[PDB]
Amino acid sequence: AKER
Amino acid sequence: AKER
Amino acid sequence: TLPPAWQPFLKDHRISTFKNWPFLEGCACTPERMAEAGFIHCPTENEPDLAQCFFCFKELEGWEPDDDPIEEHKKHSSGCAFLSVKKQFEELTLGEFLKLDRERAKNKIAKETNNKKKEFEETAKKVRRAIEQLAA
Amino acid sequence: TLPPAWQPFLKDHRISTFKNWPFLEGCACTPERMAEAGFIHCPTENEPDLAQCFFCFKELEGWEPDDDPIEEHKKHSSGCAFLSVKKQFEELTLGEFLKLDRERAKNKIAKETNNKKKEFEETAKKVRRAIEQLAAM
Ligand SMILES: [Zn+2]
Ligand SMILES: [Zn+2]
């Protein structure tokens, strides 16, 4: 997953 | 102490 | 801060509730010594020294300067579990604390119940008295 | 029960927040495995898999079935104190818990402050440009  |  | 519902577990909250408490410095039942026993001040017109265990909801009036609040509490509600907590609040676990708060909840109902009973009985005395006079 | 603002400290509360979470049974990032990592579901239109640490407020989207939520949390917010709590919840002392609740309070402050900063920097950019385009003539 990645960051907003 | 007394009771109510 | 702490959720309000939980505040009476805190000595410093209980002390704060004593406003116009007659028994001060030289006395054995100071607000501090009272809060340490679990009482909070909850005065009325005809009972201005009224106090109450926050945990077992035992109510005591007619205090005297040499009254040791812990001794008075043990005599009147020996079953009170708070009386048994030897540990300091922050030293408790949530588990322990959650169990304690639960026993409170029950005591409160049982008290609500015992009250409902007493009010019942008072009505019934009025009811009997009224029927006797109506028969005579 | 337990108070409203302190709910998210409860795993079962956190699980309960996953409604229409795409990643289920066969996946590594199930709601259960997610809540265990500290996440709660907080979806949007353009980011429907959006999730957030309840403690450090780190926000992650773009999840994949083989994503291990704890591994992803450690990579993105290594500073997160909840990541360090090895005890079971009810095994915490009130002191330990209150100490923790205060770090969260601070964490929350920081994120909001950091946000307000970004917003403000963005506004400062617009205003500056408007002025520049005026002195370009
Ligand atoms: Zn009591
Ligand atoms: Zn975190």
DSSP assignment of D66-103: T--HHHHHHHH-TT-GGGG--S-GGGSBHHHHHHHHHH
CA separation for the pair D48, C95 (Å, rounded): 36
> Rounded to the nearest whole angstrom, what is the distance from the C-alpha of residue C123 to the centroid of ligand 2?
60
Residues in chain B, total: 4
- Chain D: list its partners (3+ Cβ pairs within 8 Å): A, C
The shortest C-alpha distance from C39 to chain B (Å) reads: 13
| Method by which this entry was solved | X-ray
Here the CATH number for the domain that contains residue C53 is 1.10.1170.10
CA separation for the pair D17, D34 (Å, rounded): 11
CA separation for the pair C20, D21 (Å, rounded): 57
Residues 6+ apart with CB under 8 A from D46: none
Q: Answer yes or no: are the C-beta atoms of C28 and C66 closer than 8 Å.
A: yes
Maximum distance among all alpha carbons in chain D? 69
Token code pair at residue C70:
């812990």
How many CA atoms lie within 13 Å of C133's alpha carbon, on the beta-carbon side?
6
CB contact under 8 A, B1 and C50: no
CA separation for the pair D125, C2 (Å, rounded): 42
Report which secondary-structure segment, H or E, holds D111: helix D94-134
Structural domain count, chain D = 1
With CA atoms as reference, report the closest residue to D41 among D23, D27, D21.
D21
CA separation for the pair D71, D63 (Å, rounded): 12
Residues of D with Cβ-Cβ distance to C98 under 8 angstroms: 90
Structural domain including C16 reads 1-136
Amino acid letter, D84: S
Burial of C117 (0-12, 13-18, 19+ CB in 10 A): exposed
**Closest chain C residue by Cα to residue B3:** C60
